[PDB]
C-alpha cells in the first residue's frame, strides 16, 4: 500500500568509510565491523523505547541507518518531530560510543516526509522497503548534509518551526531529477 505522510530519515557516518581498515591486526576488517555492530545494534536499542515506540527501522545501508515514522496509520504531522527526537537520539548514542572507542564520529542526517509506497519485494527472501520520491530526497538530503546537523526541506522546515524548532537555510542543493531545491538545517 501507499501512504500520504511517512517521515523518512537517513543517518549516515561518512567517518566510517575511513575508519574501516583491512589489516592483519583487525582480523582483516572484522574488528571494525565488530565495532560497527556495536553501534548499529546500540542504535537499535532505541526502537524499543516509549518515546520512539512509533519509530520504525526500515533498513541499514552499510554504515547508514534508515528509519521512518508514520507507517502505523491510515496532530497528523507530529511524528516528524518524533523522527527528529530520534535523530537527536542516535547522536546521543553515537557520540557516547566515541567516549569508549576514543573515536570521534559525527552523525549526518536527511529527514523528509510525504507519500512513500511501502511494501515488500523479491522472489526469495522478500524485504520491506519504502519506495517513492519522498525517500529519493530524504537520502539526497543526507548525502549532501553537514555533520551534527539535520538537513530538512522547505515544508519540513516549516512544520518543524510550529513545533518549537528553528531552521536555517543551508542554501540550494540539486536533488537530482527533482532539480535544484531549497533545504534548511535544524538549529541544534
Amino acid at each position: 500500500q501507499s501512504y500520504d505522510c511517512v517521515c523518512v530519515m537517513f543517518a549516515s557516518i561518512p567517518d566510517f568509510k575511513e575508519f574501516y581498515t583491512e589489516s592483519d591486526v583487525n582480523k582483516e576488517g572484522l574488528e571494525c565491523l565488530r565495532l560497527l555492530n556495536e553501534i548499529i545494534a546500540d542504535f537499535d536499542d532505541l526502537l524499543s523505547k516509549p518515546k520512539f515506540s512509533g519509530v520504525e527501522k526500515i533498513k541499514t545501508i552499510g554504515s547508514t541507518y534508515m528509519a521512518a515514522t508514520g507507517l502505523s496509520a491510515i496532530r497528523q504531522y507530529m511524528h516528524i518531530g518524533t523522527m527528529v527526537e530520534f535523530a537527536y537520539a542516535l547522536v546521543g548514542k553515537l557520540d557516547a560510543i566515541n567516549k569508549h572507542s576514543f573515536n570521534d564520529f559525527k552523525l549526518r542526517v536527511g529527514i523528509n516526509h510525504g507519500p512513500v509506497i511501502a511494501g515488500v519485494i523479491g522472489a526469495q527472501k522478500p524485504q520491506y522497503d519504502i519506495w517513492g520520491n519522498t525517500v529519493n530526497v530524504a537520502s539526497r538530503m543526507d548525502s549532501t548534509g553537514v555533520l551534527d546537523k539535520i538537513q530538512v526541506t522547505e515544508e519540513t522546515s516549516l512544520i518543524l518551526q510550529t513545533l518549537g524548532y528553528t531552521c536555517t537555510c543551508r542554501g540550494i542543493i540539486n536533488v537530482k531529477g527533482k532539480g535544484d531545491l531549497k533545504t534548511y538545517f535544524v538549529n541544534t
Binding site: 575508519f19 589489516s23 591486526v25 574488528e31 565495532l35 567516549k99 569508549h100 570521534d104
Partner: protein, 330 residues
C-alpha cells in the same frame, strides 16, 4: 597456550621500549637504525637551542662565542635528510658543553623534548664514528613515534605471547578498540616522571593527569570491564632524580601530594630515599583510586614500578606479568 597483551599509555610513556625489551629478552641489523639515533641526537640539541630564546625569562649561553654554533644547529633544523657531517657533531657537542644550553635543558619541561636527550648528547663522540654500531641500550633509547599497531609474536617457556604496541598519541587512540576483543590483560604504561610536563598533543594538559584520565577511560571502558590492567608506573629512575633534586616539587603540580603520607604495605627498595619512596607510591595511589571505584571484582589492577630501559628490571616485571596471566587463570 597463547596470551595477547595490549599496552596502553599516554604520550611517550615508554611502550615500544618495552616491546623492544621483549625482543631483546625472548627474540646484525643494528646498522639500519643507527640513522634514527643520530636523528634523535639532532632533535635533542636543535630543540634545546631553539627553546633558549623562547623561554621566559630567556636562557642565554655563557660562551657568547657559541652564538655561531647556535646559528649552525638553527640553520639545519628543518633541513631534509641531513648527511651528518663532523661539523654537526662538533658545534652540537660544544653547545652541549655549553652551560647555558644545559641551563635551558634543566627547564626542558617548559617545552616538548624527547627523553633520550641527556643520553645521546653525552656520547656524540661514540655516535659520530663511522663504525658506530648501536649497542643494546642505544637501541632502547632511540625514540620513534609509533603510528598504528604492530604484532610481535614471541615465545616464553614454551608458552606463546602476543605483544601489541599502539599509537600512544591522541590521534591514535582510534585504533585501540581494534584489539579490545579477547585480549588477556592490559599493560598500562605511565611516566611517573612526566608529572611536570604538558603533553605534545596540545601543550597545556599535564602528561600525568592525562595518563590518569586515560587509565580511567580504559579501566572503565565498556569492553574492558572484565579485562585486568597491569599498570606500569614507568620511568622510575627519572621520577627519582626530579624528586630528589627538588628543582620541581610534586605538590605544586599535584597539590594533593601535600596532605599525602607514605604507605604501610610499601616495600621500599634497597636504600631508596624516603623522599622518593613516598613520591613513587603517591603516583601509584592516584592510579589506584581509579581501579578501586569500578571494576567490581570483574577485573583488578596490578601495578608495577618500572624502568622500560632496564632489560634487567623489565624481565623481573614481565615475569610477574607472566605469573598473573597463569595465576588469575587469565
Amino acid at each position: 597456550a597463547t596470551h595477547r597483551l595490549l599496552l596502553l599509555g599516554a604520550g611517550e610513556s615508554g611502550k615500544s621500549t618495552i616491546v623492544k625489551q621483549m625482543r631483546i629478552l625472548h627474540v646484525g641489523e643494528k646498522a639500519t637504525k643507527v640513522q634514527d639515533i643520530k636523528n634523535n641526537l639532532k632533535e635533542a640539541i636543535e630543540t634545546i637551542v631553539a627553546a633558549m630564546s623562547n623561554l621566559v625569562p630567556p636562557v642565554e649561553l655563557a660562551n657568547p662565542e657559541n652564538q655561531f654554533r647556535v646559528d649552525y644547529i638553527l640553520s639545519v633544523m628543518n633541513v631534509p635528510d641531513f648527511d651528518f657531517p663532523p661539523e654537526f657533531y662538533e658545534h652540537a657537542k660544544a653547545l652541549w658543553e655549553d652551560e647555558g644550553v644545559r641551563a635551558c635543558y634543566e627547564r626542558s619541561n617548559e617545552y616538548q623534548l624527547i627523553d633520550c636527550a641527556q643520553y645521546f648528547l653525552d656520547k656524540i663522540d661514540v655516535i659520530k664514528q663511522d663504525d658506530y654500531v648501536p649497542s643494546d641500550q642505544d637501541l632502547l633509547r632511540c625514540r620513534v613515534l609509533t603510528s598504528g599497531i604492530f604484532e610481535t609474536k614471541f615465545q616464553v617457556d614454551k608458552v606463546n605471547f602476543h605483544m601489541f604496541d599502539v599509537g600512544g598519541q591522541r590521534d591514535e587512540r582510534r585504533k585501540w578498540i581494534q584489539c579490545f576483543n579477547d585480549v588477556t590483560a592490559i599493560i598500562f604504561v605511565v611516566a611517573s616522571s612526566s608529572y611536570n610536563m604538558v603533553i605534545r598533543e596540545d601543550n597545556q594538559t599535564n602528561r600525568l593527569q592525562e595518563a590518569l584520565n586515560l587509565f580511567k577511560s580504559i579501566w572503565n571502558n565498556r569492553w574492558l570491564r572484565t579485562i585486568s590492567v597491569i599498570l606500569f608506573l614507568n620511568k622510575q629512575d627519572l621520577l627519582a632524580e626530579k624528586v630528589l633534586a627538588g628543582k620541581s616539587k610534586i605538590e605544586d603540580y599535584f597539590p594533593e601530594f601535600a596532605r599525602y603520607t607514605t604507605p604501610e604495605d610499601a616495600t621500599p627498595e634497597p636504600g631508596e630515599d624516603p623522599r622518593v619512596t613516598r613520591a613513587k607510591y603517591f603516583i601509584r595511589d592516584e592510579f589506584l583510586r581509579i581501579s578501586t571505584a569500578s571494576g567490581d571484582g570483574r577485573h583488578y589492577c596490578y601495578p608495577h614500578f618500572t624502568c622500560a630501559v632496564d632489560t634487567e628490571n623489565i624481565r623481573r616485571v614481565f615475569n610477574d606479568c607472566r605469573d598473573i596471566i597463569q595465576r588469575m587463570h587469565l
